[PDB]
Write a protein that binds this ligand. Sequence first.
Ligand SMILES: CC(C)(COP(=O)(O)OP(=O)(O)OC[C@H]1O[C@@H](n2cnc3c(N)ncnc32)[C@H](O)[C@@H]1OP(=O)(O)O)[C@@H](O)C(=O)NCCC(=O)NCCS
Ligand SMILES: [Mg+2]
Lengths: 293, 387
Amino acid sequence: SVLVDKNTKVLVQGFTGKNGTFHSEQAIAYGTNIVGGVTPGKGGTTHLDRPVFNTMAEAVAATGADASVIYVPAPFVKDSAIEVIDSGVKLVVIITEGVPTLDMLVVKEYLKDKDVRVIGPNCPGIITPGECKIGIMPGHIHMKGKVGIISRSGTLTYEAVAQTTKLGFGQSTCIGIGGDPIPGMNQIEALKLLENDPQTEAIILIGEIGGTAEEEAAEYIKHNVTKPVIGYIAGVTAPPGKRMGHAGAIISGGKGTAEEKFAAFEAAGIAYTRSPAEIGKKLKEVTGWENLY
Amino acid sequence: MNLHEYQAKDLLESYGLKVQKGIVAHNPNEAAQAFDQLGGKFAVVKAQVHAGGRGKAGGVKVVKSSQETREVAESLIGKNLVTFQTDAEGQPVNSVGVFEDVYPVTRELYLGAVVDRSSRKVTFMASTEGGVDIEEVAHNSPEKILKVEVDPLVGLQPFQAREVAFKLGLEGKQINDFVKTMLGAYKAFIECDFALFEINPLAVRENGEIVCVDGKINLDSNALYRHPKLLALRDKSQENAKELKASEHELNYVALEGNIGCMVNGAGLAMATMDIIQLYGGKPANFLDVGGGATKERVIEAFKLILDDENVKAILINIFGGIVRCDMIAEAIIEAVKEVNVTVPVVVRLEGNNAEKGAKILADSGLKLIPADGLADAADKVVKSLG
Ligand SMILES: CC(C)(COP(=O)(O)OP(=O)(O)OC[C@H]1O[C@@H](n2cnc3c(N)ncnc32)[C@H](O)[C@@H]1OP(=O)(O)O)[C@@H](O)C(=O)NCCC(=O)NCCS
Ligand SMILES: [Mg+2]
């Protein structure tokens, strides 16, 4: 596994809010160590039988948290992200959708000399099945195993999880890097981590239209990733010049098409499927893994 | 969010750029009056629509009298304009702009900027090839596109704009005017949360002035909460009626040309579903992301969006319930179907949380819902329902 495990201590920014409350309840039930959270104006209260703090500095001093998840509305995300970056927390998961692109441009630049990883925004988070979940993904579809998953989508990731669970392979760590044009953690960062993780024996890379990240990741894999990678790209049928839900899912200047992504996997010797139903099956073919169950 | 030509010009003027100025007219008398107000031998009347290709489509006319202006406005206002960059219905023309004549000119440049996703930096592009589609230039002669990556800490510096001005072969006051143009555009870009802009052409007039003749600005819609004056520019008439309606019900909808409608939670999965439909011989009719916690009301609106297309002959609902129980989702789907005229076969794939209790509720609702096991099953069945 990478980044999170049973020892991870998690703070929640926007802890007292609707989604912070709901997903924190689930996280506690799952076995995630939620140590408290931050909501300005509710410092010194308790929530879900955990302390609430006004500031991340107070929270981190009190709890020695090493991760944080952000459920704050988009307007306050740049503020919240810098706050946690400055706090001593090493891992930040940003769930929130609608963060301005230029806010992540600045945050991503701010991170360049820091010792902090940021996953998201507009992502379901990170899960090490059997150990720790940070985000909104349903624990029950996952199983502790050997397939690492990197994905720009939410529910499409759950299909690959369902397929690898059913084939009995299970997941090491699944990283939802999110649907935005400038993520805090890109595919190459995540591939490096999984390549170095002994629990991960194979990797699924899920992408979609927009940007050139999959092509760049392809070139990186060719030279630097020894574990088998199985790719899949959503949006073959997407019309050009249209946002397909996610801010980053858009073809423009005839670039960011699904086909050029498949073709890049081709050229790099990376295995892939053209059907979302056959991700697990393609992985099975490539690995030769077998089990009568 | 896109801006009208006159709105983009007003914005850029406010950051000190020079523009081909005009007056907006909502009726032909107002257009005639604008012509006399400008007080020039010639003006250019331009349909205000969010689209390029306006001239080719008959939406740009040079005029020499108030009478000619009224005629042109009367011809344009209240009709939709179809251009090579619109869909087949075109964009409504509710107004024209009557613009001052700034020609003849010495030469035409291109200037624009994007947020480059690979470098993660605001990037400017400039060329000697103004009045050419810059995509063609990029493809055929990439060496003619000059690029400047901006460092977020320092911003665009005068020396970077001078490097460009010298490579463009500008001379004299043209250099300092071009530098001020690029610096002002950068300030606007950040201060307004632009996603991209293009000025094409950026004219070098006979007296050396650097003038924005036609310009487009696309704003980051997700930043408009902090720009009330920019949000106030929004022209909903230029947005697709169904896309707009979907947005009002926490749905994301895009129409295609096909015969199988789709309803999915999550954008990745919605595009994947469209893709597997086509793999299995079908033609996806739409993208539709119903989001998390789809209620009865929200599913009703999704049905109405899809079936408003007469070409739709079957629907696939594909929902992966994680935090929300599949039997509760099945309840909402059943309640929704009961309120809508659902005239086509509906295949339903419900997976995740209690997929089994959900599938049974569907099977016993007596609405002829076709239950599907996996993604492959769902595609296979919805295409087969076409006969
Ligand atoms: C982030 C999001 C979940 C928040 O929605 P929410 O939980 O309904 O919002 P709420 O208003 O109830 O809660 C937000 C909380 O943030 C708190 N907050 C605001 N600024 C904050 C800050 N700087 N630090 C910490 N907390 C803060 C608010 O005070 C509020 O708590 P309160 O209600 O006790 O006051 C929502 O804006 C969003 O982005 N939804 C989509 C998420 C998504 O789909 N992501 C992709 C998944 S793949
Ligand atoms: Mg989404």
